[PDB]
Amino acid sequence: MNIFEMLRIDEGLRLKIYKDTEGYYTIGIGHLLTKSPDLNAAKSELDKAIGRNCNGVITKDEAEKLFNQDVDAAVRGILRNAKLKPVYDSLDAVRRCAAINQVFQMGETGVAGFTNSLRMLQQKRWDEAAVNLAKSRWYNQTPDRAKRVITTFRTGTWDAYKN
């Protein structure tokens, strides 16, 4: 297991524009196109992203390309973030994948806020961190996924994905 395989399990692969768990237009491997309810605004974002007129459909290769960029951006975002970087840098590599997954799904606004969970993770109070993480809209909206990512944080193992 690695972060791509992890996110690919969590995000799926769809080649046609679809609405994600939040109702937002998305393609590929959880590549969010827009929060606009306008399908055309999503289609314009898709075409901008891919550099061609996709008419709401892309290839597997184009999906993996966006995905590569999205993962890379998630990491680079964490490393740019004063609240996140010290925590992420304190983690072993399996728990770092958990962090990337969370930021991929939620965005770095979305989690830089998780102050208590961040402190606990930094402290390596894994069971406590895991309890705190689940106390969230995140967990309640996507519990099956959040359970897997929390287990990754709690154990620093790939047990929740292995599978």
On whether 104 is known to bind a ligand per the annotation, the reply is yes
Residue 105 in contact with ligand CCCc1ccccc1O, rule: CB under 6 A: no
State the minimum distance, in angstroms, from the CB of residue 24 to ligand CCCc1ccccc1O.
20
Task: Confirm or reject binding of residue 130 to ligand CCCc1ccccc1O (CB under 6 A).
Answer: no
33 contacts ligand CCCc1ccccc1O (rule: CB under 6 A): no
- Burial class, 91, CB count within 10 angstroms (exposed 0-12 / middle 13-18 / buried 19+): middle
| 8-state DSSP, 39 | H
What lies within 8 Å, CB to CB, of 87 at 6+ separation is: 99, 118, 121, 122
- Partnered with residue 28 across adjacent β-strands are 14
User: Was 4 annotated as part of a binding site?
Assistant: no
Residue 71 makes contact with ligand CCCc1ccccc1O by CB under 6 A: no
Q: Does 117 bind ligand CCCc1ccccc1O (CB under 6 A)?
A: yes
Quick one: which of 115, 144, 148 has its CA closest to 132? 115
**Long-range pairs of 75-79 with CB within 8 A, sequence gap ≥ 24:** 75/100, 77/103, 77/108, 78/103, 78/108
Task: Name which position in 111, 130, 146, 150 contacts ligand CCCc1ccccc1O (CB under 6 A).
Answer: 111
Please name which of 96, 28, 31, 93 lies closest in space to residue 63, comparing C-alpha atoms. 28
- Residue 113 CB neighbour total at 10 angstroms: 12
Residue 127 bears catalytic tag:
no
Catalytic option among 10, 11, 62, 108: 11
Does 78 bind ligand CCCc1ccccc1O (CB under 6 A)? Our answer is yes
Q: Considering the rule CB under 6 A, would residue 118 count as an interface residue with ligand CCCc1ccccc1O?
A: yes
Active site residue 20: yes
Could you list the residues that contact ligand CCCc1ccccc1O (CB under 6 A)?
78, 84, 87-88, 99, 102-103, 111, 114, 117-118, 121
